[PDB]
Design a protein around this nucleic acid. Structure first.
Ligand SMILES: [Mg+2]
Ligand SMILES: [Mg+2]
Ligand SMILES: [Mg+2]
Ligand SMILES: [Mg+2]
Ligand SMILES: [Mg+2]
Ligand SMILES: [Mg+2]
Ligand SMILES: [Mg+2]
Ligand SMILES: [Mg+2]
Ligand SMILES: [Mg+2]
Ligand SMILES: [Mg+2]
Ligand SMILES: [Mg+2]
Lengths: 46, 242, 201, 95, 122, 87, 95, 72
RNA sequence: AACUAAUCCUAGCCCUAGCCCUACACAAAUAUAAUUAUACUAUUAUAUAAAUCAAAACAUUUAUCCUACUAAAAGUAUUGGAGAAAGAAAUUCGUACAUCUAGGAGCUAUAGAACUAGUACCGCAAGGGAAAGAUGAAAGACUAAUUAAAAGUAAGAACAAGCAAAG
């Protein structure tokens, strides 16, 4: 079949998989946020 | 750029500024000082010099302490300085064999220990070394009181020491009430360890506990400036009358 | 914005917006720093042009762009241009002034018309005044019309403008009461209920 | 070998050379014969005598041993009662 | 493919997603899925009578502005409290216990309008 | 122009500040103190009695000497025995 | 307890310094495990009369487990410290 | 109050009104006002990052003074 | 007789020196699907760094990585499939420019920071990550000029025969 359409948007999935609360739930996720803060990213998470 | 101070001096700098500076001088001495604990997992060199057998020459020797891992569980017990040795071994004890990860674990036991100064029986996770040390110290109270922070190696052990020292410092009648003669005998037996009440309060506290304690001591609601100005006004008015 | 360049056109005007777009990245102009105390030239001051096309000609200041250390004299250092040009018509020829830097002019002694250098010094009352370096004298601050076009003396207030007396009337009586308490008592509101305990944290 | 060491930035001696060869100050190197201690029961008497001797090294071997040791091993040593006292110098050498 | 930079608002997301736009709550949602508006929770505008009022939006350009002197605790204290204490001190009828007589408030509890923590809006 | 005054070494005994963290450790040892007296003598202010070993230090020196440095008589006696054993 | 020794020699550090260790200094060998040592006896002064040990005040040597488990915990015996020795010695002399 | 957030910074925390005390509020307690040890390496990186910015700003001022004095 | 283009100088950067810091810079909102004024539902880093690589393979081993004053002792003693390599100390020396905020036989728009920006854009996410600007004293003087000058074209297609030129 034709590929390239693997993104099937869903806001509930997006915020649950990559959101603020998800990232702060684990120390590894908190370190992800710290790295993005040190780089200066405007968007720390979804 | 460069930091003004080397990284190893950073901890000392913090203790010299802020709320840390306001801590009592005796407490900071305990934090500042670094003393090596008594050897447990290695044999110390008896002498400072030995003869190198090959060339037959006098050689300086030093004691390099083995790195020991102390699990957080150990802070709820009275291990006699014992810990986990995380290291490697050579299979078959030959240098030309594989290097294998090896952890040597202490043999732990649960025992009941009675404190005369506290008149309470505690259930503690303990090693045979601790029991031997208590025997050498002629009682559980002596072991806790005599042993320094480094050798004791337990937050619970340090907590017990503060209780005993505070009990002795205040001569608290809460020990064996209705038997003043028994209370006196216990205090007399441990009279050597008495220290000022102020010092006993800070024994065994961690830095975070000390900062919380100091914050509570200096916590105060702000003074209404109505009162402050009134005092200034009254003094000036009173002085004018003089 | 660092790349903004101050020009003769007033900041924020249509002309300035055209000159200073967000994407302009022109080379910075270098201006000799002059402290607020150091500056001694003000609008309405008669000054003399030390050098240039109009060297030796006295003029009156009418604009001061301090960010460029500029002083503009009316009718001097003047080039020619057409104003109001349209496709149909050429416009009107006018003489347009160009800015003069501070060091290219000197202030003028009032009694004797000469380019006297001046020094800042306080007075008996304590008010700061410019004094001539030679022939020591008080060069008073000149009076210039307000930029917005408002002449206070000629001003006659219309509706929605408070009268002088009303604005200056004193009604405040100092007391240890908030505006809320004052208004309720004045307006006669009565409230006897009290908020229950709330925990802040 | 190590030309520039991490700690001192210097050349390093190859200790296996220092453990097998002797340098005379004149520039010569001494060595033993390979196998002089091996299977002597099947070697002829003349062969054993040849093996026991101390022998010199060639110009290329001497050049290699010079590269593999640092200058400290090339200095004058004034040992009391040295048995090689006479062999640190060359006499009547025209070349 | 999602937009990470735009704000998260109730217009976006599924219907189940809802959130406020910053309006203060005026009531409670009880059981049975019922909204119960509370009269006290609804702000009431205290509007004065503007009849006979001489102050208008603008001021005469000829009106002199005064020297800026922001009010301070000392300035307030001198204007209000100092004369009473000074007069009482001369008469001698002054004591520390009765500072409330001159307007001191020992505690803010029980006041409709508390200065700290503030319990009224602007 | 006139050249600036010539660079000169700091003269006199120098006692570093003990409390200052930056001050190097080596400058605060008793070894450093003795060096001040040696260079500048009396003006150093060092109490001369400190230069000699203290009684506890004296015992350590004497204890060390006995273990590793024998007396002449003991050295002679041991050498005599070895010769007899060799003989 | 477990007593271990390093396989690899650690170079000396000097008086006021600590040695910098390397990965190979983490390889150990077991010199001894104190569990398997011959076990000493523990000496107590009795505070009562208990079967097959002695009368109050006697000096005995007993297995460490027996002393801690029963004599010390139950109050039958007290530690044979010099202070305890002096007190009970006086009592016997008067008796 | 002055509190340390989970990212290792010091921020002023504005209190809110609640009907129950803090120890009985399960939503509030889930909020963390402490930083774990993995944050110290990031704390140093911020300090060093900031120190570089300050060093460049001071250098640039000194360079700009050169231009002024050379020009004037 | 010219189009496409070209020319430009400062935005800032680099390395040192010096110096601890204490900046923690409205209201409101935010740990709930962050930035949603109030209860529901409790809250908490990690046991030893590994491997690549060197040993011309690889299997013990392999500087820095994994920091505790400079210079010397010394690449010495010692350690090492005694191979590759690794490598002290005792013991001597050192008052460091001091003063105040300085300096450049460092870069000048493909350089110097990735930076005009951690933006645009790309990725579900961790993450990756650009490009570029140029008048004058004055634009409240109509925005400046300067250049047979790159390739590419045009002005001006070609004319038996040939590495395209050379005699
Ligand atoms: Mg795709
Ligand atoms: Mg699907
Ligand atoms: Mg040394
Ligand atoms: Mg290999
Ligand atoms: Mg292969
Ligand atoms: Mg391979
Ligand atoms: Mg391997
Ligand atoms: Mg660039
Ligand atoms: Mg770039
Ligand atoms: Mg061309
Ligand atoms: Mg042809």
């Amino acid at each position: 079949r034709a590929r390239g359409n693997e993104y099937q948007p869903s806001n509930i999935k997006r915020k649950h998989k990559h959101g603020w609360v998800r990232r702060l739930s684990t120390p590894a996720g908190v370190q992800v946020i710290l790295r993005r803060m040190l780089k200066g990213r405007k968007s720390l998470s979804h | 750029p460069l930091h003004r101070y080397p990284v190893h001096l950073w901890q000392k700098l913090r203790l010299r500024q802020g709320i840390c500076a306001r801590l009592p001088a005796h407490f900071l001495r305990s934090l500042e000082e670094e003393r090596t604990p008594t050897p447990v997992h290695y044999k110390p060199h008896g002498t400072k010099f030995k003869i190198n057998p090959k060339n037959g020459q006098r050689e300086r020797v030093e004691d390099v302490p083995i790195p020991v891992h102390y699990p957080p569980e150990s802070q709820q017990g009275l291990w006699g300085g014992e810990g986990l040795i995380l290291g490697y071994r050579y299979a078959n004890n030959d240098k030309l064999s594989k290097r294998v990860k090896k952890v040597w674990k202490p043999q732990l036991f649960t025992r009941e220990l009675y404190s005369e100064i506290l008149d309470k029986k505690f259930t503690v996770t303990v090693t045979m070394r601790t029991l031997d040390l208590i025997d050498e110290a002629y009682g559980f109270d002596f072991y806790i009181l005599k042993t320094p922070k480094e050798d004791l190696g337990s937050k619970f052990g340090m907590d017990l020491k503060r209780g005993m020292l505070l009990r002795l410092a205040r001569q608290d009648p809460h020990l064996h009430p209705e038997n003043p003669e028994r209370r006196a005998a216990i205090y007399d037996k441990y009279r050597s360890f008495v220290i000022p009440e102020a010092e006993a309060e800070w024994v065994g506290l961690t830095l975070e506990e000390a900062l919380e304690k100091q914050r509570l001591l200096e916590e105060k609601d702000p003074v209404p400036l109505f009162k402050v100005y009134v005092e200034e006004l009254v003094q000036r008015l009173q002085e004018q009358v003089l | 914005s660092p790349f903004y360049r101050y020009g003769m056109s007033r900041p924020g005007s249509i002309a300035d917006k055209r000159k200073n777009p967000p994407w302009s990245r022109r080379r910075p102009v270098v201006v000799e720093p002059i402290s607020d105390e150091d500056w001694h030239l003000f609008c309405g001051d008669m000054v003399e042009i030390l050098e240039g096309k109009d060297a030796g000609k006295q003029g009156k200041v009418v604009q001061v762009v301090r960010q460029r250390n500029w002083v503009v004299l009316e009718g001097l250092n003047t080039h020619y241009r057409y104003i109001g040009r349209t496709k149909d018509h050429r416009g009107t020829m006018i003489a347009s002034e160009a800015p003069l830097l501070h060091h290219q002019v000197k202030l003028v002694d009032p009694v004797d018309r000469k380019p006297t250098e001046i020094q800042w010094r306080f007075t008996e009352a304590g008010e700061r005044v410019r004094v001539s370096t030679r022939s020591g004298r008080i060069i008073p601050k000149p009076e210039f019309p307000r930029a917005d076009g408002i002449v206070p003396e000629t001003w006659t207030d219309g509706p929605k403008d408070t009268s002088v007396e009303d604005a200056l009337e004193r009604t405040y009586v100092p007391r240890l009461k908030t505006l809320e308490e004052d208004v309720m008592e004045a307006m006669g509101i009565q409230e006897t209920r009290r908020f229950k305990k709330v925990y802040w944290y | 070998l190590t030309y520039c060491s991490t700690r001192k930035g210097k050349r390093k001696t190859v200790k296996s050379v220092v453990h097998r060869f002797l340098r005379l100050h004149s520039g010569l190197w001494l060595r033993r014969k390979a196998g002089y201690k091996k299977k002597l029961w099947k070697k002829s008497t003349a062969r054993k005598k040849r093996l026991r001797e101390f022998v010199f090294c060639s110009k290329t071997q001497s050049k290699l041993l010079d590269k593999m040791t640092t200058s400290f091993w090339k200095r004058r040593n004034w040992y009391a009662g040295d048995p090689y006292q006479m062999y640190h110098d060359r006499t009547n050498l025209r070349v | 493919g999602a937009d990470r930079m735009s704000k998260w608002t109730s217009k976006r997301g599924p219907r189940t997603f809802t959130k406020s736009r910053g309006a203060k709550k005026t009531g409670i949602y009880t059981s049975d899925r019922k909204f119960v508006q509370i009269k006290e929770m609804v702000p009431e505008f205290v509007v004065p009578d503007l009849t006979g009022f001489k102050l208008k939006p603008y001021v005469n350009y000829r009106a002199p502005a005064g020297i800026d002197t922001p009010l301070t605790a000392k300035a307030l204290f001198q204007e209000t409290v100092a004369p009473a204490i000074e007069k009482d001190f001369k008469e001698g009828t002054f004591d520390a216990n009765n500072l409330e007589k001159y307007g001191f408030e020992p505690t803010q509890e029980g006041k409709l309008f508390q200065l700290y923590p503030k319990n009224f809006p602007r | 122009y006139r050249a600036p005054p010539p660079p000169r070494r700091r003269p006199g005994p120098h006692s570093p500040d003990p409390e200052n963290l930056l001050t190097p450790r080596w400058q605060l040892t008793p070894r450093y103190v003795a060096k001040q007296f040696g260079r500048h003598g009396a003006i150093s202010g060092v109490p001369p009695a400190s230069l000699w070993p203290t009684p506890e230090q004296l015992r350590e020196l004497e204890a060390e000497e006995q273990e590793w440095y024998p007396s002449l008589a003991t050295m002679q006696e041991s050498l005599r025995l070895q010769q007899q054993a060799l003989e | 307890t477990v007593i271990v020794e390093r396989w690899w020699k650690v170079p000396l550090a000097g008086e006021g310094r600590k040695p910098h260790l390397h990965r190979r200094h983490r390889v150990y060998k077991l010199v001894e495990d104190t569990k398997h040592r011959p076990k000493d006896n523990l000496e107590l002064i009795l505070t009562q009369s208990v079967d097959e040990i002695g009368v109050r005040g006697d000096l005995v040597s007993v297995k460490k487990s027996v002393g801690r488990n029963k004599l010390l915990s139950q109050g039958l015996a007290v530690y044979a410290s010099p202070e305890n020795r002096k007190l009970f010695e006086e009592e016997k002399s008067l008796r | 109050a002055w509190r340390r957030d989970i990212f290792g910074r010091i921020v002023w925390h504005k209190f809110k009104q609640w009907p129950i005390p803090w120890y009985l509020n399960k939503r509030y307690n889930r909020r963390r006002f402490f930083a774990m040890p993995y944050v110290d390496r990031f704390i140093r990186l911020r300090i060093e990052k900031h120190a570089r910015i300050e060093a460049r700003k001071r250098s640039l001022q000194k360079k700009k003074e050169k231009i002024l004095h050379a020009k004037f």
